[PDB]
Amino acid sequence: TVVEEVRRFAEELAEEVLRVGGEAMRPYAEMVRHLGEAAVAALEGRAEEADRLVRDVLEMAREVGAEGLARLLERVHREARELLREGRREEAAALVLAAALAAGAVAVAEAYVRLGQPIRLIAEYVAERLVELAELLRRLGVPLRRIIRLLEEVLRVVAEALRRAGVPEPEIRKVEAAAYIRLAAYLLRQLGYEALAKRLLEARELLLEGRVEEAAHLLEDVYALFHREIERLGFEAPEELRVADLLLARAIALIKAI
Amino acid sequence: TVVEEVRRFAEELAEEVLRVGGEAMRPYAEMVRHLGEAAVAALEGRAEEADRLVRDVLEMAREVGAEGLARLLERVHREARELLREGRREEAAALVLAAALAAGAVAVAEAYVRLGQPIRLIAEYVAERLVELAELLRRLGVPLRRIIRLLEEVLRVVAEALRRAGVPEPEIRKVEAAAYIRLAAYLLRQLGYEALAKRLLEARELLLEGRVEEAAHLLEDVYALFHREIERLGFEAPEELRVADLLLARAIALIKAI
Amino acid sequence: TVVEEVRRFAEELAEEVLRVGGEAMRPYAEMVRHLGEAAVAALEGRAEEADRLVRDVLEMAREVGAEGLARLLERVHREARELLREGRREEAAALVLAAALAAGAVAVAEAYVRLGQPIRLIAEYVAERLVELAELLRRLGVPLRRIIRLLEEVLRVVAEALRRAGVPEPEIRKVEAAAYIRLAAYLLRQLGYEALAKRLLEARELLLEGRVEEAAHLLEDVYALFHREIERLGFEAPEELRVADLLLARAIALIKAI
Amino acid sequence: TVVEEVRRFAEELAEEVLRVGGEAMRPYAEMVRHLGEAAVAALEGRAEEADRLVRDVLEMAREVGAEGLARLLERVHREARELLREGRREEAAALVLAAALAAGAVAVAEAYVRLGQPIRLIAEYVAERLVELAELLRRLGVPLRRIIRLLEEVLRVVAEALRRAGVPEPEIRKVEAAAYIRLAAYLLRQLGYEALAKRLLEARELLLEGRVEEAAHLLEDVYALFHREIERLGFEAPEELRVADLLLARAIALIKAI
Numbered sequence A, B, C, D: 001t002v003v004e005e006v007r008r009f010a011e012e013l014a015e016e017v018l019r020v021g022g023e024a025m026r027p028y029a030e031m032v033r034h035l036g037e038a039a040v041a042a043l044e045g046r047a048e049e050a051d052r053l054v055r056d057v058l059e060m061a062r063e064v065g066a067e068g069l070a071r072l073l074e075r076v077h078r079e080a081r082e083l084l085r086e087g088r089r090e091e092a093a094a095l096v097l098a099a100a101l102a103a104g105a106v107a108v109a110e111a112y113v114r115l116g117q118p119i120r121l122i123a124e125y126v127a128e129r130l131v132e133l134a135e136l137l138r139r140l141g142v143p144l145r146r147i148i149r150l151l152e153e154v155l156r157v158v159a160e161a162l163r164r165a166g167v168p169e170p171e172i173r174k175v176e177a178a179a180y181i182r183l184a185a186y187l188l189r190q191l192g193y194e195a196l197a198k199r200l201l202e203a204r205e206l207l208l209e210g211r212v213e214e215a216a217h218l219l220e221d222v223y224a225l226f227h228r229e230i231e232r233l234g235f236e237a238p239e240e241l242r243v244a245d246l247l248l249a250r251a252i253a254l255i256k257a258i
């Protein structure tokens, strides 16, 4: 069912891209669909069809004008080759799926920016998509640290896209910080820290409304309590606590830099 | 059920405006909803609430920047006063409904132009909306020549909106000519001229694809056959033939002027 | 009795405006009285009379020269429409009552500034008015965080009015900081923290006398004790504690920025 | 046998390209052969091999310098993807075969222009190849209107190629007009109008000999008789008559514009 899940994910993202953007950007739907096909090819054997499809999507990125997507696609090409030589298949499909998500998200984000919708919608959209992708990659079997690295790459591509569309920098920082707080809350919820997740999401809501100062104050309070809890456990803690610590630190840094 | 139909029409148009344009254009949803309210007030008694709502909608049109919509709103204000004094209610609500449709169609057309969708979509959207409004006005009881006059006013407002959005003039002419051919086919279908309607719609299809020359040739052939049929009946013909003749003449003139 | 309370509140504020400013500012008494009428109309059914009265009051604000009041009145217009469509009535009247209080307080504050009364009087007047309005909104049923948001909107309008009257910026900051300390003390008193409220009011008294440094020292001491008490309860606390924490943080920031 | 027919068509066109042009134009023989393989791949399953081969041929067109062929190959690529996703196979191979014929005919026409052969040979060659392709596409199952659209695309590419080779514009118009009259005669012959086709081909013979005026006069006479026959049938006529009408109109327009 895994390859069916990858196909469904790619097709749903392409349909949403077409619905939001119409026929103005049909290329992005083709990129999403071919990257879904390359991913399922990698999951079902093969190593050369994946290379060819990734090169095709790289050519489309070259002609359309997507720069960050093109760079990410070259990186997917080289890595996917290396890990397919090494015999590991899940991680190559993981890189391809992250590439497809980057393409869909850049399409939808540029659509939202062109027709002037508020930044809350872009931020919530990207955060929810990242959480869904993280759930999928957890289902496949990729290790968590690689998951977070892929998600940060996707966020970087989306931020570059929003920069090219003229969105002011503080709004881009708000988008990224919202994504980081959502990811941190998602990680914290699995281990059974519900109150922590609610406080983090309250801080996120105060951030998306433009109340930066109350967001920073509530974020620093919840981070202080969390960090005391971390130092309680000494030289032992589940890895998701360790990753959430860095996610929360980066979120705080971004909010302070707004 | 008539007032319920007017309410449903206004709310559906407002919901579509919001879906296509999002939160970027909330004012237009309010204008559509208040114009629907003024129309249903006029249909259910009253003469002062309609005045107040139309004045409020005129104020919104003034602040947003809609020029043609504001002019049409002043015009419906004055006329609605006159006919409400004369005791005729259906035609005042007809003017108000035409105003609401003009506002909604202007919003959706500006949304389509902002995100760069093809002109076939705008043309087909506007033409189908005009046909639906014509069916509604036929249900209420307005005489047909007033129906066509209101529909042409709506088309004029939409063309002005598309002009302000930078759409090139030939595309505006294509939009209007497609609207006229659709209206003419709709009128011809009721009296039982199916083949004529199919040929008119074939010519319209060739027009929307950019094949102007084949569209003009096929339009002139079908017009010649139709006009011979009209001259067959001498000094007698159902009134819809007489209206469709002028619709077809204007459609041909617009196509030639592209 | 609720609509009677709203009527009494509006008439009392209008009478006080007339007593303080005389016949110099008659428009503001009319704005207060019509905003009270729109609020009681909203509380007693209706959705169009409220629209008309708010539009009339906006016209008065436009002609008189009130800028911040006009902006807030447009915002009241749009929101009142939205929530009246959604069927919620208390919050629309809450926005209208906040607008009436902003108009009355702007009038009285400009009167006080014109005849050169000390800033302690403006600060104490505004703070007590905000406390009375908060009690009223608690009686109606508005949730507390909406209460605080409306009160901050009122404070923003009052600060803009005082800025247009030439009052120096540090006095405006003193007014706002006194208002926040009064609101925080009011919130803390309900939950049974008397000593905290007395110390906050002592710090406020030292602030209004011009002793900024002793006010900041005593405020930081009481804030440190309060915040230790907050962190004692971990991930649980009555919601008014959470709101008072942000109120105190903003009050301290404003005092430091004087 | 259909895939064998496509292979035979492609190889025969490639051999003719090589015989006419020698080793000077070897790239075009390879492009024709690869488009033959891509078409037969599409007819025998597959969707990714067709993608790859069309991209390879696009690269060849990029390096050689064929511009219009490159544009048509990009269009072929995008459409072939869409219709292969929709599951329709005959039309994608039809687009590929049209592309191969455009490439081969471009090569042969440039060869004829380089060694200075008269324009009658180019016109007759192109017209006969178009008739053969239309016969093949009729054998496959493509609808006739798509057949005519593909044939016009082939003619447009050929005209662009001849323009790039410095052939004067009136000779290009002669080529296209001869092609349209040949196509109209071919369509008319199936319905069983032998006299009409004979007179059209007499007009074509007079046109290719440089006698433009007698060509236009005889063409207008046969067109007048044909159009009277069309108007005889009213609102009913086989589709081939309708297509021939537009073909004849375009031929007359081109001859008049010489």
Ligand SMILES: [Zn+2]
Pocket (backbone or CB within 6 Å): A051, A052, A055, A077
């Ligand atoms: Zn490679």
Ligand SMILES: [Zn+2]
Pocket (backbone or CB within 6 Å): A227, A245, A246
């Ligand atoms: Zn740490």
Ligand SMILES: [Zn+2]
Pocket (backbone or CB within 6 Å): B051, B052, B055, B077
């Ligand atoms: Zn009036």
Ligand SMILES: [Zn+2]
Pocket (backbone or CB within 6 Å): B227, B245
């Ligand atoms: Zn006529």
Ligand SMILES: [Zn+2]
Pocket (backbone or CB within 6 Å): B056, C051, C052, C055, C077
């Ligand atoms: Zn209003």
Ligand SMILES: [Zn+2]
Pocket (backbone or CB within 6 Å): C217, C218, C221
């Ligand atoms: Zn101390």
Ligand SMILES: [Zn+2]
Pocket (backbone or CB within 6 Å): A217, A221, C227, C245
């Ligand atoms: Zn705190």
Ligand SMILES: [Zn+2]
Pocket (backbone or CB within 6 Å): A056, D051, D052, D055, D077
């Ligand atoms: Zn491709």
Ligand SMILES: [Zn+2]
Pocket (backbone or CB within 6 Å): B217, B218, B221, D227, D245
């Ligand atoms: Zn004709």
